[PDB]
Structure formats: structure tokens, C-alpha cells
Design a binder for this molecule. Structure first.
Ligand SMILES: [Cl-]
Ligand SMILES: [Cl-]
Ligand SMILES: [Cl-]
Length: 163
């Protein structure tokens, strides 16, 4: 456990994280993919051995001793708003279980279902609130990674609103 478990946000490539494990925004088939998944494949390609897992689940694969948690958010192009919301909540709950099982003191995590799986909608608040519901009962330091300047501001404001 971290001494004083915290949430932080950084605007940078999650492949350059300073945490004890990483969450990949994975596809269900364990393919290299695009965006976060692309950077993650370049940095930890050994972690894609048997990484396929269903929507709403997380599967950990070790790259050496460094854990990669493949978390599969729903593609809102295919899911109804209702079913997609349930599967996005479930994926983050499975991340919290894996982070707990691994005994890490820190985790790097992206906002699931916010890029090419967004169905063309802004899902910052939806995805972040499901991240909090799952991770609030864990004692790992959580570092959220994003790329947009405006998203960084809103994520920081949401963290500080709870403090
Ligand atoms: Cl960067
Ligand atoms: Cl996405
Ligand atoms: Cl972003």
C-alpha cells in the first residue's frame, strides 16, 4: 500500500510512466491496436502473449517482472449507452481486483472508452467517475494519463473537488 494513497494526472505517454504497473486500454483480441494500445505494444510487446480477454474484463500479463493489466472497455459504436455504461464500470472493477492481487503500490491508468471506443462522444466524466468508483477502495497511488491540455485541466479539477 502507498503511505498516503493519492490520485494524480499527467499529460504524457503512459509508456514513460513512473508507476509499478500499467493498465493498457486493450482490444478484446490482444492485438497491437492504436493510440494507448500502440504505445503499450512498442514498450511491452512480450505482454501481448495470450492477452485476449472479453469486454468488461482485465487480464494481467507480465513483461519481465513488470505487470501489464489489459483492460477491455466497450466500443460505444457497438454497445447501447446503457450496456456500454455497465461494461465500462465492470472493466474498471476488474482493474481494481488485479491491482489489489499484484500488491503494487502504484498504477498508471488511461481513461477507458474515451478515444476510438467513444462512439464520437466526450466521455471524460463518465469514464473518470467509473475509475473512481473502482479505485477508491484500493490503496495504490493512481496516476491517470491523458494527451489533451483541456482534459488534463478537467481531470485535475475533478480530483481536487474531492480533496
Ligand atoms: Cl510524452
Ligand atoms: Cl478508447
Ligand atoms: Cl486525452
Amino acid at each position: 500500500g502507498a503511505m498516503a494513497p493519492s490520485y494524480r494526472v499527467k499529460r504524457m505517454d503512459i509508456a514513460k510512466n513512473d508507476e509499478e504497473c500499467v493498465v493498457n486500454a486493450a482490444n478484446p483480441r490482444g492485438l497491437p491496436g492504436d493510440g494507448v494500445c500502440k504505445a503499450v505494444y512498442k514498450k511491452w510487446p512480450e505482454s501481448f502473449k495470450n492477452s485476449a480477454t472479453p469486454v468488461g474484463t482485465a487480464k494481467t500479463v507480465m513483461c519481465g517482472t513488470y505487470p501489464v493489466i489489459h483492460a477491455v472497455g466497450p466500443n460505444f459504436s457497438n454497445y447501447t449507452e446503457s450496456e456500454g455504461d455497465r461494461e465500462l464500470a465492470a472493466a474498471y472493477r476488474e482493474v481494481a481486483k488485479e491491482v489489489t492481487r499484484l500488491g503494487v503500490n502504484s498504477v498508471a491508468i488511461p481513461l477507458l472508452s474515451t478515444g476510438v471506443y467513444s462512439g464520437g462522444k466526450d466521455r471524460l466524466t463518465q469514464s473518470l467517475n467509473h475509475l473512481f468508483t473502482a479505485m477508491d477502495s484500493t490503496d495504490a497511488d493512481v496516476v491517470i494519463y491523458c494527451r489533451d491540455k483541456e482534459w488534463e485541466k478537467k481531470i485535475s479539477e475533478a480530483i481536487q473537488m474531492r480533496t
